[PDB]
Design a binder for this molecule. Sequence first.
Ligand SMILES: CC(C)Nc1ncc2cc(Oc3ccc(F)cc3F)c(=O)n(C)c2n1
Length: 347
Amino acid sequence: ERPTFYRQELNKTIWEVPERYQNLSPVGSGAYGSVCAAFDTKTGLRVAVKKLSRPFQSIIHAKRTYRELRLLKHMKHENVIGLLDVFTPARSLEEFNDVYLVTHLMGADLNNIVKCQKLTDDHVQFLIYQILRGLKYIHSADIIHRDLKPSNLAVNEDCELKILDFGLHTDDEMTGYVATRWYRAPEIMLNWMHYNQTVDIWSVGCIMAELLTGRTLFPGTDHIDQLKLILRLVGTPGAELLKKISSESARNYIQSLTQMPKMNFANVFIGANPLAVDLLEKMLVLDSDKRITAAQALAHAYFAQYHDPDDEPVADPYDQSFESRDLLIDEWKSLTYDEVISFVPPP
Ligand SMILES: CC(C)Nc1ncc2cc(Oc3ccc(F)cc3F)c(=O)n(C)c2n1
């Protein structure tokens, strides 16, 4: 049955939430809405509550609202953000206007942990293992994160990690000396080709390197500067990769660059575990077809003490046929409404 709702103004906005949620307090921006910390009296969990801002103001917005709800409803994995609750104060589709999403409140993101400093190899092992464990799961559902970065990786006191914001940035915020671009695979940064799951492994490589050194791997001042930093490390592309750059314009620019060989990673990451160096070399391959997969990386010797093939689950099938579907605002809205109503809380 329908719980009782109460009203409260927080982020210049009226929040109407079930009584179970108490002590609501703003904690910053999330994807497509503002996030509040709260205490869920029913579960005893500290939770993050996101109220979506104008979820159905356009077809793009309506579809994006539906997309986020579908994604969050599907994810049931220890190392991936999951949906604890979703609600609306609306009593019918007719009065349906607002969507609230509830998940675990996380302690800190990976940026707060790196803090300009080197992490110990054992800490890097555990953190990267969990990212890859979550990624294996996400990828098995044919979902791509597309924007993996330290700020999207949340970690508790026991170093247990969850991946946030998968499967969902304007040109302006990708411009210049910005972390929004530092972790992006070159093929996606410069739109070389139709990208796939392998873009996420690139991001993991960049993250792992940063955990090991305490420094951004490719802190480019712009797209071109970043590409130069990338190619200096991994080498300029060969004829084989060049053929796969379907963009004639991008392909033509690449060939204008003086050729460079791949650097020696042992000389770049001085003092690092040779097994860490080996893994980095397999993740940071320019040709995406040849990058190590999440499933393969889990079996790499670097994770010997954590790897357990019987405790690295895959996802149920995820139907994303809706992505190629053209619908009106109210149609996306009705689909979203059905998803809200049908929600079953996790045990
Ligand atoms: C201190 C910080 C690192 N902990 C933390 N914890 C949770 C979230 C959730 C976010 O997003 C949500 C996703 C799904 C939901 F159901 C609800 C949400 F609020 C979000 O964007 N951030 C930044 C978060 N941060």
